[PDB]
């Protein structure tokens, strides 16, 4: 174990815990004993942004991006119950935790793509009949992606949703129909997809690890422009305990 001072500034704090190459066993499920996740953690490795195919529909792919912010990406301290289902499957239901981190990435052009990387209200599920959690025991489910900026946020000219100006006060006698979209703030709310695939188990201490892949939309800036589709790949760590 390492103290706080043994981590500070090293960037290690933005790293989900890891298992050794040994720990590749299996953790058993009583199915008559409630289980929960004491700590889920998600660490991003890559941020992919699906590019707009221009007018020419030609099918679009995801493109790598540079992380313009710094090591503030990781999600940690996630918790909730891991209820066992009738069909012998497992479904995780998140309760609370650092379930979101605002990330901003750049592209080829130089365009900054801000997103709210999150897993709020996660409901991941596994395969039916899973007496023991083995290596690669896929977790899949949805989560909620709330607006990047919240109600109180004001744009550089003072306009906002829950507060702020009603219009473009700098152009007192201008036609307003054109400015409509920029004056009227909208609060976006959408769904997301994620799949946590195990790679390392440890039946002894009951802690699994592996990699994840999630998809969601980026910031629409209070509904001023269209959001970008984002793909996020990384690693995760879960601490399973009876409780």
């Amino acid at each position: 174990t390492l103290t706080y001072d043994d981590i500070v500034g090293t960037g290690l704090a933005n790293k989900c815990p890891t298992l050794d190459d040994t720990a590749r066993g299996a953790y058993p499920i009583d199915s008559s004993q409630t289980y929960r996740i004491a700590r889920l953690c998600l660490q991003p490795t890559t941020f992919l942004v699906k590019e707009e195919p221009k007018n020419k529909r030609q099918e679009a792919e995801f493109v790598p991006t540079k992380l313009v912010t710094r090591e503030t990406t990781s999600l940690d301290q996630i918790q909730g119950e891991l209820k066992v289902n009738s069909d012998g499957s497992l479904t995780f239901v998140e309760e609370d935790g650092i379930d979101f981190q605002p990330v901003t990435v750049q592209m080829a052009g130089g365009e900054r793509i801000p997103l709210l990387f999150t897993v709020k209200n996660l409901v991941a599920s596994t395969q039916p009949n899973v007496t023991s959690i083995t290596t690669s025991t896929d977790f899949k489910g949805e989560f909620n992606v709330p607006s990047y900026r919240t109600a109180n946020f004001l744009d550089p000219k003072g306009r906002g949703l829950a507060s702020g100006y009603d219009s473009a006060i700098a152009l007192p006698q201008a036609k307003e129909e054109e400015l409509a979209r920029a004056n009227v703030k909208r609060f976006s709310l959408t769904k997301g997809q994620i799949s946590l695939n195990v790679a390392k188990v440890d039946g002894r201490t009951g802690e699994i690890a592996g990699t994840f892949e999630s998809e969601q939309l980026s910031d629409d800036d209070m509904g001023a422009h269209e959001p970008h589709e984002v793909k996020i790949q990384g690693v995760f760590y879960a601490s399973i305990e009876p409780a």
Partner: protein, 97 residues
């Protein structure tokens, strides 16, 4: 068409009475004995399909249910508005003195 959900909400029951599904917690201070204990329970306990559903909060003492019945006339209920509920704004919407 584009509309400001918060300003539109002010044309409903919200903006006239304490909305049990949206209105921020600090609003319960304007009525006797509602704020600390009870308002927490109200807000924490999900939305409600009707004003009366607040009396069904599990754990409520006989006195708490009495107080609630008294202030029911000051309550209403509308669709949960994300703009007003997201970000924990019901516990702190960034407003102070």
């Amino acid at each position: 068409e584009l509309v400001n959900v918060v300003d539109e909400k002010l044309g409903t029951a919200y903006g006239e009475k304490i909305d049990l599904n949206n209105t921020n917690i600090a609003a319960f201070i304007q009525y006797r004995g509602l704020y600390p204990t009870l308002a927490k329970l109200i807000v924490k306990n999900a939305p409600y399909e009707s004003v009366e559903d607040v009396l069904n909060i599990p754990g409520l003492t006989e006195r708490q249910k009495q107080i609630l019945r008294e202030n029911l006339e000051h309550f209403t209920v509308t669709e949960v508005e994300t703009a007003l509920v997201e970000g924990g704004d019901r516990y702190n919407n960034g407003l102070y003195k």
